[PDB]
RNA sequence: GGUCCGGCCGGGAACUCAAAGGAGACUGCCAGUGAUAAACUGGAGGAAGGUGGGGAUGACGUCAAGUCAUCAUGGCCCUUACGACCAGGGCUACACACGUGCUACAAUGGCGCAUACAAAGAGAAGCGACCUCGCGAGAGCAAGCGGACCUCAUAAAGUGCGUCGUAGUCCGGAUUGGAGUCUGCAACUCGACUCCAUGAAGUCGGAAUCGCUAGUAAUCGUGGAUCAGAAUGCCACGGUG
């Protein structure tokens, strides 16, 4: 409610030791079993050299830029009905949202397996496909695209 | 060796009821290899408060039973026999088995 | 609990002795594989409530079927006064 | 309902269990059991004894009890009526050599179950609650102590409504673990009703 | 279905059967316990069984060797 | 090429596709192939007459197919004509094992008669 | 000579001997890697280890015997940790910084009455 | 140090642990804000901060809230009977609905084999070893422990390999049939479980709605009360998170 903190320190990935890949697996992780998701996403993570072959690192973050939303909605119960007033997004929740969308429509893709189904998304994010990258302007076209309000 | 073993319900008893056997039943015949405390058996239970209905109630209980062993270690007469000299203690099972 | 229902238990209890507890021993050994004699399978209806099942313990203080604990032999409420008024021995609240 | 036994929740620290003994699965469960056809019987002929309680010792196979009251006297005997009937009347009912030492309760007017005992037998004896329940337990703070809070049930006097009463001294701060109360309760099966009545004495703090 | 070895049925019904057959046939026994077995000898005999409120008729057949009497006789009422 | 007659199960292993037949299950179909020497990796098409037929002899051993059920709703019938509570609830569609009829029984009664 | 180091954090018991030497590792008979290596993160135990320069530094006999991995690597972690500052009384606040030093006093959770797991409330869409 | 490699045996009170007693946390100290106050915000030191985490503890009273069915009890009722005994049947009925749950709908998976880690607990009409039989539930024989000695108990997730490749399946198990075990006079009605065969609905669920702020939710097992024997419920423990 009024309570403020600050935010919780994650512990950087298996390897690379990054924060931004840590919440990553977080968020990709399920029934507390995080280590399926290292052994499922850490494979997809690197078996882009298959699908490209050097040293696959910033493809990661190259690959979000395509899935790095800057304006959301937000409805507020002003006006007697109900207003939209949409506002960007601070970085905090951009790179992590993004995450979401990268994996949360990674799973419905339906492929050959959650670590492949992944995999494929990243290459797709990057070049524009699959319902992260729609999200995007799926969400856009509500902010920015609607300031009458904002 | 004669092993000695005291359960009580607290070290409100299981205290003196001890001490008394280091320093009775152990003076200079009796060896003694040492008092020791032993794990304690945890049994707690958990009742219905309200008389019928109200399941959210309940009520939790629970009797530790507080042991210690010692135990002498040294089968001799003249300290051996000076044990039996004390039998107080109105809660304190003291298992004399061999 | 009743006055009648009371008093049954505590019969069941005795011809549950006096008969099955050492009795049923005999036919026990029959009726079962110690080489089933029929006559002794038939002989064990000679009674009835002469059985170690058909005892539902019941409030040793009131007779409340329901809420026993063989340690105190009570039924919940009983526990709790009895408890609280320390008739217990070395029981108070439990909290961890 | 919303209040927590002011004697159980102590019965760890500062209040003592009122039968002290060891027992396991085995006999414990009609252990507890005789103790209470024997405390229960230690009563019936033994009511204007004016018993506060009734520790029950049990070493092996001898308990001992002990019957505290403010009257010591009348639970004796003729030099030996009383001890000797009760000392005896323990034979089956626990099937064991079972002694009995009288303890003699100083101040009956500090002790709950006295005081307890007392209001209500006075409320069958025809007198208005508020008299005896605030006067004739008043006596608890001249004799010292600091705090007493009394509490009387409903359908007292003429009414079908039946009502609790407060009146309270001192200070009885029951939310004290460390603060050790002497609690107890009393019934009075009266011409209608049961009024009750909850006796709290603050006997000092730790 | 619950004996494994030693087919018990209620003795009650028991000593009737085996009396029916001595003497030959004759009217249905009154019985109440269902829990027993239809025994073989009791073949084409006549059985009853107090569902509750009364009894009903009981005519064994070939097939009837170690399935329940009671099975025979309902009890609730519906429809 | 159906072994019990219908259905070619093709393309998976032998065991496991075997009990395609309406009669066998995972340890019966298994049990089989021990006394057949055939294993359980080979798809049927890897075997030969002398292994996919081969199976076709000790499978005359049980009953399967259409008339193994027709026995079966005879047999069920046999026990169910007599007027015994179970057949009372065999012909009504309701549990006959020992379910709760009064409530959840979908699968058992059938679908929803609101 | 050796410094010991208990160590230990949600129901695990660390037992980690440091010697001069030797940077051999084994817990319980058994290999870092053969006991923990390739699991979730097991990278925990020599981490403090590594953290200041170890392998050709000293060596590492452990014996641990309580909680899951994670715990049971936590408390090594929190033993090895503990046991270098016998080596050196002067390397704490480097220890520290990493958070190693303390100890994970958050423990599991006890259930409750009421509750269905300690916290998690049964539901009632319709209230 | 000696090994009938197992702390198995001397031995050793170090260590884990056990469990009685102690030290430690107080805005105590540093800085800034605040009127040079309360307090706040960070910080040092620590294993642990700003009631350390969680319990326990529920003011005055409200709902004529609940319980005369645990018990007690005013009044009213019944008494060759709304008292009492037995047998069988019923409380498990359906021709629908509403709430609380478990298991799914699957490759963050099943399945085979292999194998590593924990806690808190029960137990003389008890827990039951080893060993023998049986496909298996379980049975025969019979030790140990009335307990940090023994037994119920030789965790699951997990990790290694391999497989099956998005179909109603190698998913998911409801149903039914066949035949069997163990409790107990006795399991038709109306039990738990084993084996074989059967293998449905279900491909994640509108409107709407619930819990959860950290070892939490999420998921994975373990135990116990009641109890002769009917647990997915309740109470409780720990793993991963």
Same mark, same amino acid.
């Given at each position: 409610?009024?309570?403020?903190?600050?935010?919780?320190?994650?512990?950087? &990935?298996?390897?690379?030791?990054?924060?931004?890949?840590?919440?990553?697996?977080?968020?990709?992780?399920?029934?507390?079993?995080?280590?399926?998701?290292?052994?499922?996403?850490? @494979?997809?993570?690197?078996?882009?050299?298959?699908?490209?072959?050097?040293?696959?690192?910033?493809?990661?973050?190259?690959?979000?830029?395509?899935?790095?939303?800057?304006?959301?909605?937000? @409805?507020?119960?002003?006006?007697? @009905?109900?207003?939209?007033?949409?506002?960007?997004?601070?970085?905090?929740?951009?790179?992590?949202?993004?995450?979401?969308?990268?994996?949360?429509?990674?799973?419905?893709?339906?492929?050959?397996?959650?670590?492949?189904?992944?995999?494929?998304?990243?290459?797709?994010?990057?070049?524009?496909?699959?319902?992260?990258?729609?999200?995007?302007? &799926?969400?856009?076209?509500?902010?920015?695209?609607?300031?009458?309000?904002? | 060796?004669?092993?000695?073993?005291?359960?009580?319900?607290?070290?409100?008893?299981?205290?003196?009821?001890?001490?008394?056997?280091?320093?009775?039943?152990?003076?200079?015949?009796?060896?003694?290899?040492?008092?020791?405390?032993?794990?304690?058996?945890?049994?707690?239970?958990?009742?219905?408060?309200?008389?019928?209905?109200?399941?959210?109630?309940?009520?939790?209980?629970?009797?530790?039973?507080?042991?210690?062993?010692?135990?002498?270690?040294?089968?001799?007469?003249?300290?051996?026999?000076?044990?039996?000299?004390?039998?107080?203690?109105?809660?304190?099972?003291?298992?004399?088995?061999? | 609990?009743?006055?009648?229902?009371?008093?049954?238990?505590?019969?069941?209890?005795?011809?549950?002795?006096?008969?099955?507890?050492?009795?049923?021993?005999?036919?026990?050994?029959?009726?079962?594989?110690?080489?089933?004699?029929?006559?002794?399978?038939?002989?064990?209806?000679?009674?009835?409530?002469?059985?170690?099942?058909?005892?539902?313990?019941?409030?040793?203080?009131?007779?409340?079927?329901?809420?026993?604990?063989?340690?105190?032999?009570?039924?919940?409420?009983?526990?709790?006064?009895?408890?609280?008024?320390?008739?217990?021995?070395?029981?108070?609240?439990?909290?961890? | 309902?919303?209040?927590?036994?002011?004697?159980?929740?102590?019965?760890?620290?500062?209040?003592?269990?009122?039968?002290?003994?060891?027992?396991?699965?085995?006999?414990?469960?009609?252990?507890?059991?005789?103790?209470?056809?024997?405390?229960?019987?230690?009563?019936?002929?033994?009511?204007?004894?004016?018993?506060?309680?009734?520790?029950?010792?049990?070493?092996?196979?001898?308990?001992?009890?002990?019957?505290?009251?403010?009257?010591?006297?009348?639970?004796?005997?003729?030099?030996?009526?009383?001890?000797?009937?009760?000392?005896?009347?323990?034979?089956?009912?626990?099937?064991?050599?079972?002694?009995?030492?009288?303890?003699?309760?100083?101040?009956?007017?500090?002790?709950?179950?006295?005081?307890?005992?007392?209001?209500?037998?006075?409320?069958?004896?025809?007198?208005?609650?508020?008299?005896?329940?605030?006067?004739?337990?008043?006596?608890?703070?001249?004799?010292?102590?600091?705090?007493?809070?009394?509490?009387?049930?409903?359908?007292?006097?003429?009414?079908?409504?039946?009502?609790?009463?407060?009146?309270?001294?001192?200070?009885?701060?029951?939310?004290?673990?460390?603060?050790?109360?002497?609690?107890?309760?009393?019934?009075?099966?009266?011409?209608?009703?049961?009024?009750?009545?909850?006796?709290?004495?603050?006997?000092?703090?730790? | 279905?619950?004996?494994?070895?030693?087919?018990?049925?209620?003795?009650?019904?028991?000593?009737?059967?085996?009396?029916?057959?001595?003497?030959?046939?004759?009217?249905?026994?009154?019985?109440?316990?269902?829990?027993?077995?239809?025994?073989?000898?009791?073949?084409?005999?006549?059985?009853?069984?107090?569902?509750?409120?009364?009894?009903?008729?009981?005519?064994?057949?070939?097939?009837?060797?170690?399935?329940?009497?009671?099975?025979?006789?309902?009890?609730?009422?519906?429809? | 090429?159906?072994?019990?007659?219908?259905?070619?199960?093709?393309?998976?292993?032998?065991?496991?596709?075997?009990?395609?037949?309406?009669?066998?299950?995972?340890?019966?179909?298994?049990?089989?192939?021990?006394?057949?020497?055939?294993?359980?990796?080979?798809?049927?098409?890897?075997?030969?007459?002398?292994?996919?037929?081969?199976?076709?002899?000790?499978?005359?051993?049980?009953?399967?197919?259409?008339?193994?059920?027709?026995?079966?709703?005879?047999?069920?019938?046999?026990?169910?004509?007599?007027?015994?509570?179970?057949?009372?609830?065999?012909?009504?569609?309701?549990?006959?094992?020992?379910?709760?009829?009064?409530?959840?029984?979908?699968?058992?009664?059938?679908?929803?008669?609101? | 000579?050796?410094?010991?180091?208990?160590?230990?954090?949600?129901?695990?018991?660390?037992?980690?001997?440091?010697?001069?030497?030797?940077?051999?590792?084994?817990?319980?008979?058994?290999?870092?890697?053969?006991?923990?290596?390739?699991?979730?993160?097991?990278?925990?135990?020599?981490?403090?280890?590594?953290?200041?320069?170890?392998?050709?530094?000293?060596?590492?006999?452990?014996?641990?015997?309580?909680?899951?991995?994670?715990?049971?690597?936590?408390?090594?972690?929190?033993?090895?940790?503990?046991?270098?500052?016998?080596?050196?009384?002067?390397?704490?606040?480097?220890?520290?910084?990493?958070?190693?030093?303390?100890?994970?006093?958050?423990?599991?959770?006890?259930?409750?009455?009421?509750?269905?797991?300690?916290?998690?409330?049964?539901?009632?869409?319709?209230?």
């Amino acid at each position: 409610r009024r309570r403020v903190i600050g935010q919780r320190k994650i512990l950087p &990935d298996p390897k690379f030791g990054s924060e931004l890949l840590a919440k990553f697996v977080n968020i990709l992780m399920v029934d507390g079993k995080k280590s399926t998701a290292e052994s499922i996403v850490y @494979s997809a993570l690197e078996t882009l050299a298959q699908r490209s072959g050097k040293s696959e690192l910033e493809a990661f973050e190259v690959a979000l830029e395509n899935v790095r939303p800057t304006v959301e909605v937000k @409805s507020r119960r002003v006006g007697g @009905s109900t207003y939209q007033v949409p506002v960007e997004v601070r970085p905090v929740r951009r790179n992590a949202l993004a995450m979401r969308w990268i994996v949360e429509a990674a799973r419905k893709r339906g492929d050959k397996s959650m670590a492949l189904r992944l995999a494929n998304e990243l290459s797709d994010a990057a070049e524009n496909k699959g319902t992260a990258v729609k999200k995007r302007e &799926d969400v856009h076209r509500m902010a920015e695209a609607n300031k009458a309000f904002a | 060796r004669i092993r000695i073993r005291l359960k009580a319900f607290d070290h409100r008893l299981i205290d003196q009821a001890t001490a008394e056997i280091v320093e009775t039943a152990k003076r200079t015949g009796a060896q003694v290899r040492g008092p020791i405390p032993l794990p304690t058996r945890k049994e707690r239970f958990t009742v219905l408060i309200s008389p019928h209905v109200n399941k959210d109630a309940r009520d939790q209980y629970e009797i530790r039973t507080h042991l210690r062993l010692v135990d002498i270690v040294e089968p001799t007469e003249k300290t051996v026999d000076a044990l039996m000299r004390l039998d107080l203690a109105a809660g304190v099972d003291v298992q004399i088995s061999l | 609990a009743k006055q009648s229902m009371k008093a049954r238990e505590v019969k069941r209890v005795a011809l549950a002795d006096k008969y099955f507890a050492k009795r049923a021993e005999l036919k026990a050994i029959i009726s079962d594989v110690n080489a089933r004699w029929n006559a002794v399978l038939k002989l064990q209806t000679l009674p009835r409530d002469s059985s170690p099942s058909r005892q539902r313990n019941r409030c040793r203080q009131t007779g409340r079927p329901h809420g026993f604990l063989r340690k105190f032999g009570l039924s919940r409420i009983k526990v709790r006064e009895a408890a609280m008024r320390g008739e217990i021995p070395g029981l108070k609240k439990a909290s961890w | 309902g919303q209040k927590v036994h002011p004697n159980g929740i102590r019965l760890g620290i500062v209040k003592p269990w009122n039968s002290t003994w060891f027992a396991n699965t085995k006999e414990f469960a009609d252990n507890l059991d005789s103790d209470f056809k024997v405390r229960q019987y230690l009563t019936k002929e033994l009511a204007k004894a004016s018993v506060s309680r009734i520790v029950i010792e049990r070493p092996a196979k001898s308990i001992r009890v002990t019957i505290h009251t403010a009257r010591p006297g009348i639970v004796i005997g003729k030099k030996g009526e009383d001890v000797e009937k009760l000392r005896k009347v323990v034979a089956d009912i626990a099937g064991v050599p079972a002694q009995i030492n009288i303890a003699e309760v100083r101040k009956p007017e500090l002790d709950a179950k006295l005081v307890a005992d007392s209001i209500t037998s006075q409320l069958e004896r025809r007198v208005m609650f508020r008299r005896a329940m605030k006067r004739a337990v008043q006596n608890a703070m001249r004799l010292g102590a600091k705090g007493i809070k009394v509490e009387v049930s409903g359908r007292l006097g003429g009414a079908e409504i039946a009502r609790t009463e407060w009146y309270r001294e001192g200070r009885v701060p029951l939310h004290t673990l460390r603060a050790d109360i002497d609690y107890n309760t009393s019934e009075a099966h009266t011409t209608y009703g049961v009024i009750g009545v909850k006796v709290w004495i603050f006997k000092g703090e730790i | 279905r619950s004996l494994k070895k030693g087919p018990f049925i209620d003795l009650h019904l028991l000593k009737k059967v085996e009396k029916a057959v001595e003497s030959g046939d004759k009217k249905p026994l009154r019985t109440w316990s269902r829990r027993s077995t239809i025994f073989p000898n009791m073949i084409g005999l006549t059985i009853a069984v107090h569902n509750g409120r009364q009894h009903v008729p009981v005519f064994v057949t070939d097939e009837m060797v170690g399935h329940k009497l009671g099975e025979f006789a309902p009890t609730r009422t519906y429809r | 090429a159906r072994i019990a007659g219908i259905n070619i199960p093709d393309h998976k292993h032998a065991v496991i596709a075997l009990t395609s037949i309406y009669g066998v299950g995972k340890t019966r179909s298994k049990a089989i192939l021990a006394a057949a020497g055939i294993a359980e990796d080979v798809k049927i098409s890897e075997l030969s007459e002398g292994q996919i037929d081969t199976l076709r002899d000790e499978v005359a051993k049980f009953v399967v197919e259409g008339d193994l059920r027709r026995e079966i709703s005879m047999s069920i019938k046999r026990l169910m004509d007599l007027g015994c509570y179970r057949g009372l609830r065999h012909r009504r569609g309701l549990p006959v094992r020992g379910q709760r009829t009064k409530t959840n029984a979908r699968t058992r009664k059938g679908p929803r008669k609101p | 000579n050796q410094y010991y180091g208990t160590g230990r954090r949600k129901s695990s018991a660390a037992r980690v001997f440091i010697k001069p030497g030797n940077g051999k590792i084994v817990i319980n008979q058994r290999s870092l890697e053969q006991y923990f290596g390739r699991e979730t993160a097991r990278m925990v135990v020599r981490q403090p280890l590594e953290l200041v320069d170890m392998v050709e530094k000293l060596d590492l006999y452990i014996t641990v015997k309580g909680g899951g991995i994670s715990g049971q690597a936590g408390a090594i972690r929190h033993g090895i940790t503990r046991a270098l500052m016998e080596y050196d009384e002067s390397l704490r606040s480097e220890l520290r910084k990493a958070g190693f030093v303390t100890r994970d006093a958050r423990q599991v959770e006890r259930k409750k009455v009421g509750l269905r797991k300690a916290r998690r409330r049964p539901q009632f869409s319709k209230r």
